[PDB]
Amino acid sequence: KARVYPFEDDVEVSTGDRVAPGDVLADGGKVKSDVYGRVEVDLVRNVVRVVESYDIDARMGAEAIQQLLKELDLEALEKELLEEMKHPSRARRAKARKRLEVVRAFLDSGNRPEWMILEAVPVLPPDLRPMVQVDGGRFATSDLNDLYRRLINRNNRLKKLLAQGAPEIIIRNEKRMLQEAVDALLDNGRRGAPVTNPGSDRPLRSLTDILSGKQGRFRQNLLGK
Amino acid sequence: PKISTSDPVRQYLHEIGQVPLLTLEEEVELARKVEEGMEAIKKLSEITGLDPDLIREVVRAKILGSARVRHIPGLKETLDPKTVEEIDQKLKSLPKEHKRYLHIAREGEAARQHLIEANLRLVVSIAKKYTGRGLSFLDLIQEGNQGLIRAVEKFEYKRRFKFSTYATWWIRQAINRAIADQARTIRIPVHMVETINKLSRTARQLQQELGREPTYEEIAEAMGPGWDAKRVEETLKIAQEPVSLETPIGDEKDSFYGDFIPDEHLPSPVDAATQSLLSEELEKALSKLSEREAMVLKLRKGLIDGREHTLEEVGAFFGVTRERIRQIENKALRKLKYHESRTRKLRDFLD
Amino acid sequence: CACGKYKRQRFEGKVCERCGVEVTKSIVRRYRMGHIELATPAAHIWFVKDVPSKIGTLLDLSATELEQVLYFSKYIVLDPKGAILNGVPVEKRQLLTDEEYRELRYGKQETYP
Ligand SMILES: [Zn+2]
């Protein structure tokens, strides 16, 4: 589903551009386009194709969310939600007002919602997730390190693939794994736990478990000095 | 609502959707278009004078970039502003004879994308074999995927080899290399994964050859020429997991391995209190001394370095050097023995 | 320092020129943070899986919608213009499948043997 445009001499733009309607295309600007498309420029058969295509900015993953959260005008949402107080009665009040409890709490604190997204993952000081040498020239170490490793590895690889200008499908795949890797670090096992390949199918202790203890808690107990 | 929880692999195995039907004809054409592209980028930086890698960046930008022009390019490393337009407006404002190389270059980068996508299934089938070897299936796939990029970078179509079974190699390479690097917590050299894997190979024969688990001497003879009782042992030590601090102990619920490991770094109230007093009492000791003398020992030990001869060279910054400083140590140390034998302060610190 | 140029505490507070390591107490190792700069932002799971998803709540996205974009199975729009399949122009938000996206920003093609 394209639109062909023959040309005699000159040819502005090249194959892969986003154009139209009515954009300079070839021959001193004698050939214009008609509908929004994607340029193809046929080398041999003197014709440029415009393939029916818009320039949609639709995205996936946290990058997509972060944006929405950045552009979100809370001042204006607060007014807008107060404008749904018993307007469809018990229906959309009961619901879309627990929505306001959040908005307000953000406004009172001065915390950009965006911040819920991470673009820099912090790292716990090494001395308390140590790498001790024990008996027998063998080592003991926290699971965090192994959680942190695999995250670093996937980030670094993602950098390479992006630097390579790899196909967006193998990039998605990477981004998926990265998101998961971050999940696994912060609060492991809220999506089917990861384990140390050998040892056993014992799930790795995440930060969240290390903080509170996985045992529901913080009681139970495990509590005393 | 915990439905689509563990998709990952199933999810990614939707690239059946990207039509893998690659005829020889289509395979060759794409490969050809890649090559002619790579060459065009040379002709370009030859004509423009710009860096070839920098051009390829801009060609990639104009094909991929629409929502792929990264909003954070590594915090000001790659520049994604109007510098790309400026480059493209340069290339586009070339005469016909040269400008054709731009169009060749664009096609090429478009052809790369397809040629890679077409063979993603190939990676999966190869990576399917390397599982469990210490690295997640998805990790292996991605690792192998870059093997496939490189294979496309290297492949020459003029030699009519089947791209499939060519790339095969490069994919295998990147995977194996990944395992040697990433699989272990304490990173190890590759020729050391080699050997470790070679030992756990020979342990298999030597078990069933003998019946019993082989002695170390047994497994060394088998290993070859550089090998030794001590070496087999000292190796396997290195070969191990290692142990998780978060490993529970017997009672399971309350105790963990880590709980039992004691700090031997930081000095305990008794220790700390000592060496602090020592500092104070040594001062009180070498205070009543010649100021020049006191520094000698403080520069023979008292600051930082053993000073076998180094101090004896730069003779207390300025002063008579070597065999006459040897004499000062003697009298300074012996001057302390006068005092110490009488006022027993320092005696007790000798444990 | 790491390389070993500095000791004593005489040089208290100096970063080493060769090895790059500050000369302080070692205890500082149980208190000093690092970070990792992600190539792509990632969602903090607390603000997603703890219900009501504090972000979902903020965006009018149900947990299943959130999942879909956040874990890469549906695209969410930010700026559009497009209008096909239904014929209906889709607007600032709400999500679409691969084949929906690959029909809009990529076009309609078909090969035949
Ligand atoms: Zn140093």
XYZ file of C-alpha atoms and ligand atoms in Angstrom:
690
model
C 0.000 0.000 0.000
C 2.226 2.716 -1.424
C 2.193 5.665 -3.830
C 4.708 5.728 -6.700
C 6.317 8.965 -7.927
C 8.439 8.929 -11.130
C 11.277 11.466 -11.487
C 13.420 12.683 -14.397
C 16.580 14.278 -12.939
C 17.063 15.504 -9.328
C 15.805 13.544 -6.281
C 15.597 15.194 -2.853
C 15.317 12.916 0.258
C 16.534 9.319 0.502
C 15.159 5.872 1.353
C 13.829 5.770 4.912
C 12.632 9.323 5.511
C 9.257 10.323 6.994
C 7.332 12.695 4.698
C 4.102 14.276 3.331
C 1.543 15.574 2.602
C 2.965 17.745 -0.177
C 6.689 17.545 0.488
C 9.619 18.223 -1.836
C 10.587 14.899 -3.341
C 12.460 15.242 -6.641
C 13.248 17.409 -9.668
C 13.920 20.937 -8.326
C 10.759 20.418 -6.254
C 8.367 19.574 -9.128
C 7.346 16.282 -7.548
C 5.537 16.686 -4.234
C 3.947 13.906 -2.165
C 0.277 13.307 -1.288
C -0.128 11.223 1.861
C 1.960 10.632 4.980
C 4.532 7.928 4.316
C 7.959 6.313 4.343
C 10.384 6.887 1.458
C 11.811 3.994 -0.564
C 13.674 5.520 -3.552
C 13.850 2.934 -6.317
C 17.417 2.970 -7.572
C 16.688 1.300 -10.930
C 13.056 1.807 -11.957
C 13.066 5.605 -11.764
C 10.309 6.060 -9.198
C 10.150 6.875 -5.480
C 7.580 5.006 -3.400
C 5.821 6.478 -0.411
C 4.441 3.681 1.748
C 1.249 4.542 3.680
C 2.597 5.190 7.174
C 2.238 7.791 9.935
C 5.030 8.909 12.288
C 3.360 7.478 15.434
C 5.248 7.854 18.650
C 4.019 4.730 20.409
C 6.447 3.056 22.783
C 6.870 0.108 25.138
C 8.248 -0.528 28.616
C 9.277 1.858 31.376
C 10.585 4.436 28.864
C 6.961 4.851 27.711
C 5.624 5.162 31.249
C 8.328 7.523 32.466
C 7.208 9.905 29.736
C 3.525 9.857 30.723
C 4.567 10.375 34.350
C 6.787 13.287 33.339
C 4.066 15.073 31.373
C 1.419 14.475 34.024
C 0.033 17.779 35.341
C -1.036 17.001 38.892
C -2.310 20.481 39.607
C -4.749 19.980 36.724
C -5.628 16.399 37.588
C -6.521 17.413 41.151
C -9.016 19.980 39.857
C -10.225 17.466 37.266
C -10.841 14.670 39.796
C -12.588 16.940 42.311
C -14.857 17.403 39.277
C -15.986 13.770 39.548
C -17.275 13.995 43.121
C -20.736 12.349 42.975
C -21.254 13.383 39.330
C -21.992 9.806 38.265
C -22.983 9.189 41.952
C -21.795 6.059 43.873
C -20.365 4.692 40.581
C -17.232 6.662 39.624
C -16.941 8.487 42.952
C -16.173 5.352 45.006
C -13.516 4.405 42.442
C -11.952 7.448 40.738
C -11.366 9.264 44.050
C -9.000 6.741 45.579
C -7.137 8.007 42.547
C -7.108 11.465 44.153
C -5.711 10.191 47.465
C -2.535 9.435 45.492
C -2.367 12.653 43.443
C -2.775 14.686 46.607
C -0.085 12.774 48.560
C 2.341 13.470 45.690
C 1.417 17.141 45.605
C 1.859 17.564 49.348
C 5.298 15.893 49.313
C 6.718 17.481 46.147
C 7.866 14.209 44.625
C 7.909 13.871 40.878
C 5.950 10.635 39.981
C 8.585 9.993 37.321
C 10.877 9.084 40.253
C 9.031 5.769 40.611
C 10.871 4.864 37.439
C 14.595 4.130 37.871
C 17.285 5.250 35.441
C 20.082 4.784 37.980
C 19.942 1.712 40.223
C 21.820 2.320 43.486
C 24.347 -0.196 44.854
C 24.572 -1.376 48.500
C 28.013 -0.763 50.080
C 30.105 -3.892 49.512
C 31.233 -4.368 53.079
C 27.739 -5.594 53.965
C 27.256 -8.120 51.173
C 30.884 -9.166 51.534
C 33.049 -11.664 49.769
C 34.662 -13.562 52.638
C 37.241 -16.211 52.182
C 36.313 -19.180 54.344
C 38.002 -22.515 54.973
C 39.401 -24.508 52.039
C 40.086 -21.635 49.630
C 36.357 -21.429 49.019
C 34.254 -18.308 49.351
C 31.088 -17.078 50.991
C 29.086 -14.180 49.561
C 25.676 -12.553 49.518
C 23.131 -13.358 46.847
C 22.780 -9.646 46.071
C 26.169 -9.709 44.310
C 24.920 -12.391 41.990
C 21.696 -10.469 41.452
C 23.711 -7.307 40.793
C 26.085 -9.083 38.422
C 23.406 -10.437 36.083
C 21.767 -6.993 35.979
C 25.069 -5.283 35.062
C 25.648 -7.946 32.394
C 22.293 -7.331 30.744
C 22.646 -3.525 30.883
C 26.074 -3.666 29.321
C 24.858 -5.971 26.599
C 21.902 -3.652 25.984
C 24.392 -0.826 25.476
C 26.242 -2.875 22.849
C 23.114 -3.861 20.981
C 21.911 -0.284 20.928
C 25.351 0.839 19.840
C 25.231 -1.791 17.113
C 21.852 -0.527 15.966
C 20.421 -4.015 16.309
C 16.847 -4.948 15.200
C 14.326 -3.505 17.643
C 12.947 -6.981 18.344
C 16.185 -8.228 19.882
C 16.387 -4.934 21.740
C 12.916 -5.384 23.225
C 14.000 -8.835 24.300
C 16.971 -7.258 26.067
C 14.877 -4.514 27.682
C 12.397 -7.137 28.887
C 15.221 -9.091 30.552
C 16.617 -5.909 32.042
C 13.296 -4.943 33.565
C 13.048 -8.442 35.009
C 16.612 -8.309 36.237
C 15.845 -5.126 38.149
C 12.692 -6.722 39.554
C 14.647 -9.772 40.638
C 17.113 -7.525 42.502
C 14.678 -5.239 44.271
C 11.929 -7.656 45.183
C 12.639 -11.132 43.888
C 9.825 -13.633 43.412
C 6.977 -11.331 42.523
C 7.047 -13.015 39.035
C 8.474 -16.620 39.306
C 11.742 -16.667 41.313
C 15.369 -16.955 39.930
C 17.797 -19.378 41.546
C 21.504 -20.230 41.389
C 21.693 -22.653 38.470
C 23.556 -25.337 40.413
C 23.383 -25.425 44.249
C 19.633 -25.829 44.421
C 16.309 -24.352 43.333
C 16.603 -22.169 46.436
C 15.408 -18.696 45.437
C 17.969 -15.898 45.763
C 17.486 -13.433 48.569
C 16.477 -10.046 47.150
C 16.724 -6.706 48.927
C 13.079 -6.830 49.926
C 13.522 -10.221 51.633
C 16.772 -9.054 53.187
C 15.004 -6.042 54.641
C 11.825 -7.636 56.021
C 12.386 -11.387 55.709
C 9.870 -12.946 53.283
C 8.037 -14.586 56.246
C 5.090 -12.207 55.718
C 6.373 -10.137 58.641
C 7.894 -8.023 60.047
C 6.265 -10.552 62.439
C 6.597 -13.607 63.037
C 9.887 -12.149 64.465
C 13.730 -12.997 64.042
C 14.092 -9.873 66.194
C 16.687 -9.265 68.910
C 20.272 -8.230 69.638
C -4.601 -11.454 38.595
C -1.279 -13.321 38.113
C -1.933 -14.524 34.534
C 0.874 -13.429 32.154
C 3.587 -13.779 34.823
C 6.254 -16.083 33.269
C 5.964 -15.391 29.529
C 9.603 -14.321 28.740
C 10.687 -17.234 26.512
C 7.226 -18.004 25.107
C 6.871 -14.301 24.474
C 10.152 -14.020 22.510
C 9.283 -17.125 20.499
C 6.943 -14.816 18.642
C 9.382 -14.092 15.854
C 7.618 -16.772 13.885
C 5.668 -13.559 13.124
C 8.666 -12.104 11.277
C 8.514 -14.243 8.109
C 11.655 -16.438 8.318
C 11.093 -17.735 4.770
C 14.474 -16.712 3.387
C 15.110 -18.115 -0.074
C 18.663 -18.411 -1.349
C 17.661 -15.614 -3.752
C 16.476 -13.362 -0.892
C 19.405 -14.384 1.311
C 21.953 -13.442 -1.363
C 20.244 -10.175 -2.375
C 20.189 -8.984 1.245
C 23.775 -10.068 1.866
C 24.767 -8.343 -1.398
C 22.935 -5.170 -0.364
C 24.743 -5.221 2.989
C 28.184 -5.441 1.336
C 27.522 -2.794 -1.279
C 26.312 -0.694 1.665
C 29.487 -1.200 3.703
C 31.559 -0.195 0.679
C 29.390 2.857 0.038
C 30.127 4.157 3.555
C 33.845 3.997 2.633
C 33.306 5.831 -0.662
C 31.386 8.344 1.473
C 33.946 9.142 4.145
C 36.434 9.151 1.282
C 34.427 11.937 -0.459
C 32.977 13.797 2.522
C 36.125 13.406 4.618
C 34.024 12.494 7.656
C 34.750 9.393 9.765
C 33.219 6.195 8.312
C 31.957 5.066 11.699
C 30.362 8.473 12.224
C 28.553 8.269 8.865
C 27.281 4.753 9.624
C 25.940 6.212 12.850
C 23.974 8.819 10.883
C 22.693 6.299 8.332
C 21.547 4.103 11.224
C 19.898 7.153 12.763
C 17.818 8.016 9.700
C 16.577 4.464 9.280
C 16.024 3.311 12.858
C 15.480 6.703 14.508
C 11.876 7.844 14.804
C 11.368 6.630 18.366
C 14.839 4.981 18.342
C 16.798 8.258 18.480
C 17.689 7.681 22.157
C 16.441 10.323 24.618
C 19.422 9.572 26.898
C 22.440 8.821 24.616
C 24.630 7.776 27.588
C 24.467 11.278 29.175
C 26.290 13.246 26.409
C 28.413 10.602 24.641
C 26.598 10.161 21.328
C 25.134 13.425 20.025
C 21.533 13.121 18.754
C 20.592 16.737 18.036
C 20.720 18.657 14.733
C 24.233 17.252 14.196
C 22.543 14.361 12.342
C 20.566 16.721 10.087
C 23.767 18.693 9.451
C 25.464 15.465 8.362
C 22.475 14.333 6.269
C 22.105 17.789 4.731
C 25.807 17.478 3.832
C 25.386 14.036 2.231
C 22.108 14.997 0.531
C 23.762 18.097 -0.953
C 26.224 15.960 -2.912
C 26.275 15.721 -6.717
C 24.371 12.800 -8.305
C 27.520 10.741 -9.010
C 28.374 10.677 -5.296
C 24.882 10.959 -3.822
C 23.956 7.501 -5.194
C 26.322 6.105 -2.516
C 24.039 7.500 0.165
C 21.067 5.599 -1.256
C 23.234 2.467 -1.474
C 24.272 3.001 2.132
C 20.645 3.399 3.304
C 19.455 0.252 1.492
C 22.381 -1.632 3.014
C 21.480 -0.727 6.582
C 17.864 -1.593 5.852
C 19.021 -4.958 4.455
C 21.117 -5.727 7.514
C 18.048 -5.404 9.748
C 16.140 -7.978 7.719
C 19.065 -10.390 7.342
C 19.490 -10.400 11.096
C 15.738 -10.822 11.860
C 15.493 -13.665 9.346
C 17.988 -15.788 11.297
C 16.902 -15.128 14.877
C 15.318 -18.563 14.890
C 18.741 -20.021 14.078
C 20.220 -18.585 17.269
C 17.442 -20.120 19.352
C 18.120 -23.569 17.870
C 21.875 -23.315 18.585
C 21.432 -21.775 22.079
C 18.993 -24.605 22.819
C 22.052 -26.787 23.151
C 24.070 -24.704 25.661
C 21.435 -24.602 28.408
C 22.208 -25.354 32.047
C 25.907 -24.780 31.408
C 25.624 -21.924 33.933
C 23.684 -19.331 32.014
C 20.004 -18.550 31.503
C 18.389 -19.619 28.221
C 17.408 -16.043 27.406
C 20.898 -14.819 28.242
C 22.310 -17.432 25.858
C 19.909 -16.331 23.125
C 20.963 -12.701 23.415
C 24.644 -13.628 23.675
C 24.246 -15.741 20.539
C 22.275 -12.949 18.899
C 25.332 -10.707 18.917
C 27.266 -13.626 17.491
C 24.796 -13.355 14.615
C 25.319 -9.621 14.212
C 29.077 -10.119 13.899
C 28.486 -12.992 11.423
C 26.626 -10.521 9.193
C 29.448 -7.993 9.591
C 31.978 -10.611 8.442
C 30.160 -12.604 5.742
C 31.281 -12.209 2.108
C 28.649 -13.268 -0.383
C 31.023 -13.628 -3.316
C 32.103 -16.961 -1.832
C 28.832 -18.850 -2.199
C 28.632 -20.427 1.296
C 25.185 -20.923 2.859
C 24.849 -17.928 5.285
C 22.928 -20.130 7.729
C 25.691 -22.641 8.331
C 28.303 -19.881 8.215
C 26.804 -17.677 10.888
C 26.334 -20.899 12.844
C 30.009 -20.628 13.799
C 29.998 -17.006 15.045
C 26.890 -17.718 17.147
C 28.601 -20.703 18.733
C 31.631 -18.484 19.416
C 29.824 -15.701 21.218
C 27.945 -18.201 23.373
C 30.982 -20.187 24.514
C 32.876 -16.939 25.153
C 29.939 -15.613 27.151
C 29.927 -18.697 29.353
C 33.656 -18.452 30.095
C 33.176 -14.813 31.167
C 29.740 -14.520 32.746
C 28.917 -17.903 34.281
C 31.061 -17.608 37.431
C 30.826 -15.186 40.356
C 34.562 -14.943 40.631
C 35.571 -14.287 37.001
C 38.224 -16.653 35.629
C 40.473 -16.810 32.500
C 39.168 -18.758 29.503
C 42.027 -21.277 29.296
C 41.037 -21.978 32.907
C 37.462 -22.841 32.083
C 39.056 -25.095 29.443
C 41.054 -26.983 32.038
C 38.355 -27.112 34.685
C 36.009 -28.614 32.059
C 38.822 -30.958 31.046
C 39.158 -32.224 34.631
C 35.469 -32.887 35.207
C 35.721 -34.812 31.919
C 38.492 -37.093 33.129
C 36.878 -37.627 36.515
C 34.107 -39.490 34.621
C 36.420 -42.095 33.046
C 38.512 -42.456 36.193
C 35.411 -43.154 38.241
C 34.193 -46.011 36.017
C 37.697 -47.078 34.967
C 38.571 -47.714 38.606
C 35.265 -48.169 40.415
C 36.314 -45.841 43.248
C 36.700 -42.042 42.996
C 40.302 -41.491 41.739
C 43.075 -40.227 44.044
C 44.619 -36.865 43.144
C 47.772 -38.556 41.869
C 45.532 -40.739 39.689
C 43.780 -37.824 38.053
C 47.060 -35.936 37.480
C 48.746 -38.690 35.452
C 45.658 -38.801 33.268
C 45.684 -35.037 32.820
C 49.004 -34.904 31.015
C 52.452 -33.347 31.162
C 52.249 -30.188 33.298
C 50.269 -32.019 35.963
C 50.874 -32.803 39.558
C 49.147 -34.055 42.720
C 49.094 -30.510 44.174
C 47.879 -29.075 40.920
C 44.710 -31.136 40.657
C 43.837 -30.245 44.261
C 44.784 -26.562 44.118
C 42.604 -26.363 41.015
C 39.375 -27.953 42.220
C 39.520 -25.547 45.173
C 39.258 -22.704 42.628
C 36.553 -24.596 40.727
C 33.854 -24.302 43.448
C 30.450 -22.545 43.524
C 30.935 -20.567 46.156
C 28.801 -20.615 49.392
C 25.831 -18.334 50.017
C 25.957 -16.141 53.113
C 22.187 -16.358 53.116
C 22.311 -20.185 53.437
C 20.171 -21.269 56.411
C 21.522 -23.500 59.205
C 19.838 -26.651 60.572
C 17.098 -24.812 62.496
C 16.462 -23.234 59.046
C 14.131 -20.361 60.113
C 16.356 -18.172 62.321
C 20.008 -18.882 61.557
C 22.114 -18.316 58.455
C 25.702 -19.116 57.504
C 26.583 -15.429 57.597
C 25.504 -15.094 61.240
C 28.530 -17.110 62.350
C 31.295 -15.385 60.412
C 33.202 -13.037 62.754
C 34.847 -9.719 61.880
C 38.600 -10.132 62.082
C 39.297 -6.823 60.380
C 38.219 -4.179 62.919
C 39.969 -4.217 66.323
C 37.827 -5.163 69.327
C 37.607 -2.817 72.356
C 40.573 -4.600 73.961
C 42.735 -4.422 70.804
C 41.775 -0.854 69.877
C 42.432 0.354 73.444
C 45.897 -1.168 73.365
C 47.363 0.179 70.119
C 45.996 3.636 71.007
C 47.876 3.513 74.338
C 50.969 2.192 72.559
C 51.013 5.250 70.280
C 50.761 7.432 73.369
C 53.498 5.639 75.327
C 55.981 5.433 72.409
C 55.611 9.193 72.051
C 56.263 9.682 75.772
C 59.292 7.429 75.173
C 61.002 8.962 72.147
C 60.080 12.516 73.198
C 63.166 12.693 75.439
C 65.581 12.182 72.534
C 67.519 14.294 70.001
C 64.966 15.674 67.520
C 67.177 14.636 64.594
C 67.548 11.127 66.108
C 63.819 10.679 66.771
C 62.945 11.336 63.130
C 65.569 8.786 61.955
C 63.654 5.878 63.470
C 60.361 7.555 62.504
C 61.637 7.469 58.921
C 63.190 4.022 59.245
C 59.771 2.686 60.301
C 57.626 5.325 62.057
C 56.000 6.779 58.972
C 55.539 4.323 56.031
C 58.201 2.049 54.506
C 60.701 -0.550 55.789
C 63.674 1.457 54.425
C 66.225 -1.375 53.949
C 68.555 1.261 52.450
C 66.225 3.982 51.017
C 66.480 6.267 54.081
C 70.239 5.737 54.156
C 70.321 7.316 50.683
C 68.284 10.505 51.268
C 70.054 10.962 54.613
C 67.291 12.473 56.777
C 66.566 14.775 53.799
C 69.888 16.566 54.451
C 72.819 14.998 56.366
C 75.804 12.594 56.302
C 74.649 9.419 54.545
C 74.824 5.589 54.707
C 77.332 3.959 57.093
C 77.118 6.960 59.471
C 73.319 6.654 59.767
C 73.877 2.950 60.597
C 75.681 4.227 63.719
C 72.790 6.565 64.693
C 70.178 3.765 64.750
C 72.402 1.895 67.207
C 72.804 4.804 69.643
C 69.151 5.875 69.325
C 67.813 2.345 69.981
C 70.367 1.825 72.755
C 69.391 5.221 74.253
C 65.855 3.849 74.687
C 67.162 0.730 76.474
C 68.795 2.971 79.119
C 65.309 4.374 79.827
C 63.181 1.283 79.265
C 65.111 -1.079 81.548
C 64.477 1.486 84.306
C 60.901 2.664 83.563
C 59.136 -0.486 82.408
C 56.376 1.029 80.284
C 56.850 -0.661 76.903
C 57.690 -4.154 78.239
C 54.103 -5.438 78.376
C 53.147 -4.879 74.713
C 55.203 -7.864 73.485
C 52.279 -10.296 73.035
C 45.616 3.207 48.991
C 45.186 0.269 46.609
C 48.570 0.465 44.849
C 50.207 1.142 48.213
C 51.751 4.608 47.732
C 50.002 6.080 50.813
C 49.656 4.995 54.453
C 50.137 6.312 58.034
C 47.022 8.573 58.186
C 49.519 11.415 57.794
C 47.924 11.811 54.360
C 44.375 11.672 55.798
C 41.745 12.506 53.164
C 43.956 12.448 50.039
C 42.780 10.555 46.963
C 45.775 8.763 45.395
C 47.121 9.997 42.040
C 48.098 6.567 40.759
C 45.399 4.276 42.156
C 42.452 6.677 42.610
C 41.682 5.467 46.165
C 40.871 7.764 49.116
C 42.974 7.376 52.246
C 40.488 7.048 55.125
C 39.195 4.446 57.497
C 38.262 1.160 55.859
C 34.951 1.160 57.796
C 33.779 3.616 55.114
C 33.212 0.509 52.956
C 30.104 -0.448 54.876
C 28.490 2.930 54.254
C 29.467 4.066 50.726
C 26.885 3.700 47.948
C 27.496 2.965 44.286
C 25.197 3.129 41.295
C 24.519 1.644 37.918
C 23.284 3.772 35.073
C 20.659 1.789 33.091
C 20.685 1.956 29.300
C 16.901 2.132 29.549
C 14.776 3.209 32.522
C 13.202 0.445 34.579
C 10.112 0.431 36.770
C 10.491 0.108 40.523
C 8.485 -3.007 41.281
C 7.020 -1.820 44.591
C 5.306 1.054 42.759
C 3.773 -1.496 40.346
C 2.946 -4.796 42.046
C 1.826 -3.359 45.381
C -1.920 -2.840 44.827
C -3.397 -0.418 43.947
C -0.362 0.052 41.631
C 0.620 3.600 42.652
C 1.643 4.358 39.037
C -1.257 2.507 37.366
C -3.586 4.356 39.735
C -1.988 7.606 38.574
C -2.445 6.853 34.877
C -5.823 5.109 34.744
C -4.104 1.859 33.788
C -5.362 -1.484 35.097
C -2.723 -3.929 36.285
C -2.972 -5.994 33.073
C -2.526 -2.923 30.857
C 0.491 -1.810 32.886
C 2.014 -5.293 32.594
C 1.534 -5.274 28.855
C 3.543 -2.122 28.156
C 5.910 -2.439 31.134
C 6.956 -5.936 30.032
C 6.739 -5.456 26.242
C 3.650 -6.963 24.598
C 1.673 -3.809 23.777
C 2.711 -0.277 22.731
C 1.165 2.810 24.301
C 0.795 5.961 22.162
C 2.187 9.379 23.075
C 1.773 11.360 19.820
C -0.291 9.936 16.942
C -2.237 11.098 13.811
C -2.864 7.592 12.411
C -6.282 6.163 11.583
C -6.635 2.625 10.121
C -8.149 -0.927 10.475
C -11.153 0.430 12.382
C -10.755 3.666 10.424
C -10.861 5.352 13.844
C -7.961 7.712 14.634
C -6.375 6.560 17.913
C -5.345 9.249 20.386
C -2.892 10.274 23.075
C -2.949 7.067 25.119
C -4.345 3.518 25.006
C -2.432 0.581 23.611
C -1.966 -1.511 20.444
C -0.518 -4.880 19.371
C 2.516 -5.548 17.217
C 0.491 -6.071 14.047
C -1.405 -2.890 14.893
C 1.838 -0.899 15.270
C 3.560 -2.608 12.312
C 0.550 -1.619 10.191
C 0.576 2.004 11.306
C 4.218 3.210 11.548
C 5.492 0.673 9.014
C 2.663 0.322 6.450
C 0.868 -2.556 4.703
C 2.853 -5.055 2.599
C 2.479 -8.670 1.488
C 4.793 -11.008 -0.388
C 3.556 -13.892 -2.563
C 5.470 -17.018 -3.745
Zn 47.645 4.476 45.537
